[PDB]
Amino acid sequence: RNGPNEHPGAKYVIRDSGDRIDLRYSKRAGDIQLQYGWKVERHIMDNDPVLFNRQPSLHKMSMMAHRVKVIPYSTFRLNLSVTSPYNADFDGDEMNLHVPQSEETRAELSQL
Amino acid sequence: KQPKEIGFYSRTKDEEYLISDDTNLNYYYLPDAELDRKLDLSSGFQKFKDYYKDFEDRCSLRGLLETIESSERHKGKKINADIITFRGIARKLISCAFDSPSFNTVDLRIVSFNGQLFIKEVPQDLNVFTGYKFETLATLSNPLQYTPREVIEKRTKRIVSHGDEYISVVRTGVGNCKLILGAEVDCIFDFKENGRDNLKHYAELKCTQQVANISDTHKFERKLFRTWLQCFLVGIPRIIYGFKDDHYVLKTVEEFSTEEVPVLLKNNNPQVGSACLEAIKWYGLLTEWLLKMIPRDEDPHSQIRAFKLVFENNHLRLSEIEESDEEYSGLIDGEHILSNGFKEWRKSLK
Amino acid sequence: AIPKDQRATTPYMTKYERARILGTRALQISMNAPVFVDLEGETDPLRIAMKELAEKKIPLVIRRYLPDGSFEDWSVEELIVDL
Amino acid sequence: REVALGKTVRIRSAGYKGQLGIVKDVNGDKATVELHSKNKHITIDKHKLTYYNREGGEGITYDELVNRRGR
Amino acid sequence: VPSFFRWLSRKYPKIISPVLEEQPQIVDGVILPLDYSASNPNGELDNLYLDMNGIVHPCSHPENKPPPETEDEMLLAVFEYTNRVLNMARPRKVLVMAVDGVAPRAKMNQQRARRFRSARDAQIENEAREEIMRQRDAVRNKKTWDSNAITPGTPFMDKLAAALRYWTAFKLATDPGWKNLQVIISDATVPGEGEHKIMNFIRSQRADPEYNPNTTHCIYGLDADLIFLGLATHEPHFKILREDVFAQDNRKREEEKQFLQKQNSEQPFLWLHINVLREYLSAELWVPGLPFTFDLERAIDDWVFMCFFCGNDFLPHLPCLDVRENSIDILLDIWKVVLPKLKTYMTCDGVLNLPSVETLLQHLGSREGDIFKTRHIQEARKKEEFVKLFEPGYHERYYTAKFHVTPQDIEQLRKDMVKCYIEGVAWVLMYYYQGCASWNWFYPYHYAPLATDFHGFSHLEIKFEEGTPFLPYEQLMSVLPAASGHALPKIFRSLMSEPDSEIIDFYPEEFPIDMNGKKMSWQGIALLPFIDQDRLLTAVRAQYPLLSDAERARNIRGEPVLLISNKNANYERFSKKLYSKENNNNNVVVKFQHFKSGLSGIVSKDVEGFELNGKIVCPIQGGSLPNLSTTLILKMSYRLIPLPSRNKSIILNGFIPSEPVLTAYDLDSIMYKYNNQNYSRRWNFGNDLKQNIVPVGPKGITQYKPRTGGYRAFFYFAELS
Amino acid sequence: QYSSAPLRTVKEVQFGLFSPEEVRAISVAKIRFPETMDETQTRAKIGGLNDPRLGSIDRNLKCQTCQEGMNECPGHFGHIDLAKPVFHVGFIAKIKKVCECVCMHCGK
Amino acid sequence: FLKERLMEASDAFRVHICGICGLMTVIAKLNHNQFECKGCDNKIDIYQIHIPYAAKLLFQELMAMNITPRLYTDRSRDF
Amino acid sequence: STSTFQTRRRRLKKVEEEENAATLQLGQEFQLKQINHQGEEEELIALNLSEARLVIKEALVERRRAFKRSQKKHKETREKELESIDVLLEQTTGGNNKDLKNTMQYLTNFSRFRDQETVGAVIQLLKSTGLHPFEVAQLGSLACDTADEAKTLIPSLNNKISDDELERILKELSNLETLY
Amino acid sequence: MFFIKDLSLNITLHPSFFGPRMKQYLKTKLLEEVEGSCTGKFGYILCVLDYDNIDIQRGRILPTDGSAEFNVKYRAVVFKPFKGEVVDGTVVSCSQHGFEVQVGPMKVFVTKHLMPQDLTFNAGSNPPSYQSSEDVITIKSRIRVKIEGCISQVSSIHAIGSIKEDYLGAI
RNA sequence: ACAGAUCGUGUCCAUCGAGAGGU
Ligand SMILES: [Mg+2]
Ligand SMILES: [Mg+2]
Ligand SMILES: [Mg+2]
Ligand SMILES: [Zn+2]
């Protein structure tokens, strides 16, 4: 019902046998009832385990799993103590973020 | 045994007891659109027209005697069955097993003039009106294919009246004894066959309240037990039931089958299935006890004996009423039953 | 090729095995599989999986493959969890 | 066939009072309106914002249903 | 691709379903016969009411490979097509084939026009061929028979009728799976246009007391109105079979040739199930807060009436309603918005409500100007009847150009046009709903009025007469154009070969096709003079006596012929009734109902000359077809039971509702006018043809869907939860 | 899309050369014309480098061989009948070594 | 996570491989629910595998190089 | 769905030794010395016309008895034979079961042995020879009058059985099939 | 001709059905699956005997989803029309191409080119058949027919029959 | 017999080299 406009919203609704539904063109949201077994492509919310990477990736510490915290500015914010394993500073560095797409990957990233 | 049709009898208003016609037959017609619509089953409560016991004493078997006499005249010889009972009356006879005598009080008289058994019948509003209304909008006078659309439109808002009763005489044999029962027909769901058995073409309908918890579910299960015993007693394919609510609005109409009801009933609760088995055994036990000590004399000139059956202390109390009692004078001496034509036909059989 | 009295593998439960079991249980719960424990009002499949693993109520069997090709089957409830 | 499409509008009330923008997309009761000075897009109720002419003139409320034109 | 097919595809998706046709295999030069008794993968089918006229025509004179044989090739082609469609459908209860015969005077004028044209284009093509060999003997012309030769009363119709009986007898004898199949043949002698007989038979069967509401019927035909005809009879479990044209593969331009041959030999077919379309209509005709009660049964007949008003083969199309693809929605929404203004419905079993039609036409005329302006704008944009002043709607110009009459005459002509148009609308509705209103009604005009007309029809009443069906010879004279002397009696040829006063006026030699009435195809209008009744009738009745008795014997109305097999359940009863009594008279008629097997009706002794323990000769004498005997089939006359009352559109009791193959999402999509514009994803209709099965066949003993309550409803709710 | 074929995972890969008979056996068409789209640059030439049996060229139409679109059709292999045998560029050294190993007049 | 990143978040393709030849040259007609391998006239053992489109392209290029990368779903050992 | 793993270079055997033949040459799946689920080196089991009918009938009655006991714990000649297996199939297998009716009807119509003792002793009589169980099943099922019919019926018995022994057990089977 | 083989079947079960009744769920799955099957390798499956110790092994869980793959072991009666085998059946259909036989559940065709020219299609008799000398054959009559080979391994399974053999016809 | 204007969803402009960059 929130729609793909506010942060706590969704972009797509997947019914049985594919048949993707777009929540920004159809506008039929609100009058749609979600039956069991469907899939909803919600936005990335808080406490979501994601993969955080810096290049070049020399050791395994260059890949870490963090918890998503939504911030009101267009930049990546991290604790100062994790810069040493990343070997990164704040003079213009660029780092990549990857999100899981299944429970298997999410759980294994969180626990490993 | 398999029930076999003997004949069809009509009992219209004013006690005319017409024989051998289908003027009092109805046909089921209820589209799903009507069920979806919020039909009202309580309008015109003041339009009720009653032709039941209040109008005249319907507790008689004169019509049944006339129709069986006509059937015997058409066929000949004597029917091997030994017990005559109304379809509704026979249900109350066996219902006392699981019902208190206060709830089910039955007063009947037997006659052994034919060396057989002759049961004689002896004697809220809003619910009755709602049931009659459901019957009226659930039935049609003539077959639908020959029914004009305007007739259907008038029926959708027609008056509520009592009548058009269809009575069918069926000889049903259970165990080592054969019995003949006068069934009641309310509607014909499927097609109708002329001059042929219509037992598979008959139906049965009623009304009940909507359930809310397990207590109402158990009450509906008991009602289904009663109607299944009824159907097993007569033989009826359709046990369609109606559902009503506090606002008296039709909600759901079902399509129960005779064979499917016992299986689901046993699956729900074993206790009600055990009660079903106990009742079907007790019916045969009661019949075999009745055909044991009752004095049967095939001689028409033999003296007739009158008995009274009252269910007290979980026992059927049967005793011969003295001939000096006024009940016998007003029954046999007063020619209340055993009409002149019926007695003449009985004497001719001798 | 499934010995029982000659199981030389460690009786403890590895981190990879724990992660795989938790993930599989969470995914099954998410896709509406029956749950054998009460949830205490929880609504996250992963934490439900951890709660099930806490009391050893996960009906799964671990098949540890030896390098040659042989294997032995270890039940989840019989594996000691210490990490 | 929404009337509020590609028309210069002015936002009233809320925190964007007096701003000038052009409607881009309409999603039910909510419509997406861009901004002239600010380089951002905001979504507000279509019944709230007023409607002006493309060239420039008087402004009117959402009563444009009875007159499928500009101004 | 036809506009109607894609229009119904985009407006009503998931309706077209592919046919799971089984491909026969040949090994070691041996072709294994198809198992008729095997279960049909396309669902259970019982009735196969089929139109033979729609299968004989495509085989004859096609776009490629014309048949050189006079009749043998055509008979073989129709036989193989019938075998293919029968194997594809696999009926189990009754198969009915109908052939077009006598029609009402309206279809009469229309066919006249159509053929006359066909003759003109045949003359053009053969004179072009003649000059082609001129610029190069008479044996290279390859002049195939004209399409006008297919007309009731010709010897070709007799040959077709004889061929069908032999074909069905051979199939019944050689196929063990046809033990419980009944075949009904309606030759050209029986009046009807092929589909009218079908709907008459369907309505007659629905009136049987023992008729089964769960029976499934399928109609095969390439006509564009049979889809609406199926919805008009209010019979669920109805599927329409037709050849697929959406592919439209490349035509002909070794192994490549063999692949092209097998591609043509495997033309696909598409299903048009309307049981799942009934939900589409039910989610479309709903009106918010309508005064009177609303039901699906009353909504579909009104939609069918509106669709027929859009365009019919009897009356000319309205000038404002010419596309017949977009104006339907316009009049549908007009009817929707004007429905609350009325306290009743529009049509009641074919009865037309005058005030409702008056309001509808007044609203259409009010909206007529906007539609005309929009179409003018579209035409001008596309570009960027002789005189059209667009500002005043060219009503007077249209009248003076299509009739050439003075203002007082145009007023009286608009009055008469309104009268005749409303009478024709009532007649076509009555014909398409219940029986035939009249066999003599005609439209004495070449166009229809428009604009603010039709408002004075309220003070009128409709009353027709049964009349009498036209004889084959008079109908043949009326429909057949000039020349085409083949398949004609010598008396008619002699009448043609003399300069008679009525010959030139009624049947001229040149058709003026100057009336294109805004179109770009063979489509046109009938400028031919409207033939009267008295002159043609007197000429035919005067030419009748001198005709030979043998030729005059082909003037009986006839009756459908039943061809039940030797193992039918009612075969013994029919044989005992019609042969043991040996009454030797046309008086023994049985009245068996639909309870036993099927095909409820009244039968009688055959008048063709069928005999027991006899033999039937091959009618075509080609292909070395086996000569069978009469001990395996029974040729007897069949008669339709007259309807005791009007064919009321009421669903029969005990009907099992079809399960919804449709989700509520598309229901609300159509309800809210979501359209495919919002769905920016590519809606590949080809991919929409893969994942559709559309199960057909009653689902569940109970005839009422769960609507809460208790007991079983509570158990179902608990299971769902 | 649903396929009735059972779903399995690859367990091993067997490398090897392609026999001249096998390529012809698996080939669905023979390529002889070196020019493509010779039908007045409208359609694809039959037997050319863009034969329709080789696979679909645009998403809407289907592939004649298997009847899917581009997203599902994996493509099909043809063959070319060389007039004379041609040495493999990547096997010249191996061919020379094996020719040195064996006799040039007999297979011994 | 590696498998998901390589397949689900990237190219993912499904192909049919003949169980005798081991190649992907299998004629599949999902409309009629039948498969055939013209190389060895095989119709009763067809398997479907999930491989990235890049792997399919590499295998097709190798086949064009007169090299057969036969793929099998069973382990070959002993006898 | 298979019971034998790949062997003898099943990937690219490229032999194509036909598909079937009358003179043995049975299919690969129906090969001698089959592999049992738990055991090994077990020969192929061949069933005669009478043996197969008894096997399916006994399996059907066993399944019906199991279903009846589960429900309880939860709570002539040819003409008579058709009713028996009709009422057996109408509730045991369930479903469409269209194919099962024809097989059972063919088994009943063409049944040779109807006595349990006779069919049981058939294997004891036939075990004397070392013939392949397929051909012994063929001679047990198909009727015969002397050695010529048996020799002409199949081409798998060329000089594999002595004529005197062949005629002896052919007459033995003739009387064992004519006694019932 | 009838054989019993230790067949194997692979099935996939959704984890939403992972209850105590998985064993009986798989049992009914197999029961409706192999009944009436027309596999081209094994042949015709008629009955599934030995409804005991099915020995349902452990179900490996696919990494993609929560479903589990089961490998059930079972034995059943098979039916395959081995080429060159003499069988006896009954006539069901008889067109001008030939007369069919009802050996088991199949539709073996005896095409006109197989049996000698003695048999002639006489349509005069009420049942269409091939009445001729050397004994009488009709619809629903005893007939022994040999099998030439197996065709159409996919979908339905059937064969082609012949009568041109000494001591093969009539009977 | 029957026998269509476009509509409705529509997919992107690619490759090869060269240079300038920033962690
Ligand atoms: Mg830096
Ligand atoms: Mg009642
Ligand atoms: Mg038409
Ligand atoms: Zn392809």
Ligand SMILES: [Zn+2]
């Ligand atoms: Zn292969």
